[PDB]
Amino acid sequence: DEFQWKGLPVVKSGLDVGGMPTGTRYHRSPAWPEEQPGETHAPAPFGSGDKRYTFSQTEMLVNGLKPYTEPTAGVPPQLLSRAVTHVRSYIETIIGTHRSPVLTYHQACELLERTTSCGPFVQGLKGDYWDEEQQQYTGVLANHLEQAWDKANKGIAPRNAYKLALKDELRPIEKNKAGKRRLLWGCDAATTLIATAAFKAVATRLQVVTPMTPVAVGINMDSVQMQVMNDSLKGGVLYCLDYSKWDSTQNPAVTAASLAILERFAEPHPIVSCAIEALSSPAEGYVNDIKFVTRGGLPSGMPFTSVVNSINHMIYVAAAILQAYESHNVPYTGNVFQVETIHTYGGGCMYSVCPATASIFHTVLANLTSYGLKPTIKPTNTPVFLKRTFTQTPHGIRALLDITSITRQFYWLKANRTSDPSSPPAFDRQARSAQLENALAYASQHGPVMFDTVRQIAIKTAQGEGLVLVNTNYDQALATYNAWFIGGTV
């Protein structure tokens, strides 16, 4: 029986999943005891210590879960069909109509992320149960997986259940003041296994062919693939959107259609239906002794979140463009993704529209926001995608990582948990230096001048952390990035 919990419609789970982690893994770097000019990010609030601050973590959870309680308008039932077949047809013409065989049990198991949680039903990390050169899972997780597997082949779908938490990361100071913190949903490992077996081969086929499909997932932004994307933009009117609150505004019907398109490139199988059944159902987030069941939107932690959401984006935008043409009563000749050029990774997203669609992009936007989306409207000559500014360099176009993304890595370091971010960190030294070697290699792509200011920051950091760096000068830092980039080898 439903009941209110902090303003949220909630139900007793029958378990006690526990409270959310207190504290942060982020420490301020020993070499940087005060706030440098331009500094704009800090560790997200972390509870009773999180000490500069003071919000109730549970209220920060509830605040984030709130958008999932009020559902979205979606796409008109009869536009959806037309948009769907545009999306399905275009991806049919580039990856073909072969239906990919379901993965075997061992293949899906080894594809699971071992560093992360087992979900709400099993405790610890997945890699507490991994046995190598038996090449399998062992003990009580393996029991959880084998059962879900056997049941899936019988047609019993796994639960769309998640362990709710909060993402420990560096967020804007403004957002930290307001008690904002991003949601983490740790999917039931079993559900990931089933969904991996069902769609991994389809996602791989999309990845092999990126960015020839508006599903960009898997793209090496530090390779030639990024230039392929950049090349595709020429000749069109460029819009660059990064939609706000994308996860919580995803329509269940659009998601069902997206899962139906993936279904088309997979062998019909008890496992595929079970995946579709699970990933189609409302997401159940477990926290403490309750569970919250979504009324709309999509959990960020869902298996193949990037792929499903990117097909969602395709459906949404195709619908919006068609609708626009329909209202202005102009026939839409060909496929949306040939006439226009689209690239999506979840909630963003670049559009290279044709002069005819660009003419009526106002209506296109109004349609997207009428579906319940929030795009976040002026054309641009600057392609921004996956947090990268596409910029001309003396050695070709490069996807440039925010200068602030680079420097921010030197002032803070990910280490042990703490309620005091200022306390001296205990960290793997050689790994820290690897991160900062990489950081500098990125920096180098910004030119000799702006590299040097990062160079100086890197050397001070070397002193205070007792490190040794090789990319600490321009040419060596250039050489190593280029090695990547004609390399493919990041």
Side-chain angles (χ1 to χ4, degrees), residues 16 36 58 96 102 138 182 319 367 374 417:
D16 186 348
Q36 309 302 121
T58 139
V102 141
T138 213
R182 294 172 81 194
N367 291 326
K374 332 201 194 218
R417 341 224 341 100

Side-chain angles (χ1 to χ4, degrees), residues 132-170:
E132 33 225 341
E133 239 58 32
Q134 251 213 282
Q135 278 182 133
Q136 58 173 100
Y137 286 98
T138 213
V140 52
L141 175 65
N143 172 244
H144 181 64
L145 298 173
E146 308 262 20
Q147 294 302 264
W149 188 262
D150 179 76
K151 280 193 166 89
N153 287 304
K154 264 75 176 292
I156 316 286
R159 297 157 286 188
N160 197 27
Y162 299 82
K163 193 169 198 306
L164 279 165
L166 293 169
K167 282 180 178 170
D168 181 26
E169 76 212 335
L170 300 165

Side-chain angles (χ1 to χ4, degrees), residues 81-211:
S81 294
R82 195 139 26 94
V84 158
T85 130
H86 268 88
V87 176
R88 196 185 72 257
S89 188
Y90 186 82
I91 109 107
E92 277 172 354
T93 70
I94 94 285
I95 75 154
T97 54
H98 182 253
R99 303 188 114 96
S100 290
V102 141
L103 295 180
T104 201
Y105 176 82
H106 167 258
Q107 276 162 358
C109 283
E110 61 180 359
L111 277 164
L112 302 167
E113 177 58 32
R114 269 158 251 177
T115 301
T116 201
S117 155
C118 306
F121 306 124
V122 173
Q123 280 220 108
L125 308 160
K126 297 197 196 76
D128 290 352
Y129 306 87
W130 181 256
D131 177 322
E132 33 225 341
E133 239 58 32
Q134 251 213 282
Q135 278 182 133
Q136 58 173 100
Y137 286 98
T138 213
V140 52
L141 175 65
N143 172 244
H144 181 64
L145 298 173
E146 308 262 20
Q147 294 302 264
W149 188 262
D150 179 76
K151 280 193 166 89
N153 287 304
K154 264 75 176 292
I156 316 286
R159 297 157 286 188
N160 197 27
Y162 299 82
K163 193 169 198 306
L164 279 165
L166 293 169
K167 282 180 178 170
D168 181 26
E169 76 212 335
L170 300 165
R171 292 291 285 176
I173 279 153
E174 326 90 66
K175 303 203 207 296
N176 291 357
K177 286 273 172 64
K180 272 177 263 184
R181 193 171 164 186
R182 294 172 81 194
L183 295 147
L184 182 75
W185 316 58
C187 192
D188 172 27
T191 299
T192 312
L193 172 77
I194 305 309
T196 299
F199 297 132
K200 179 67 197 172
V202 181
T204 295
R205 276 206 270 157
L206 286 162
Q207 209 179 243
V208 165
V209 104
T210 201

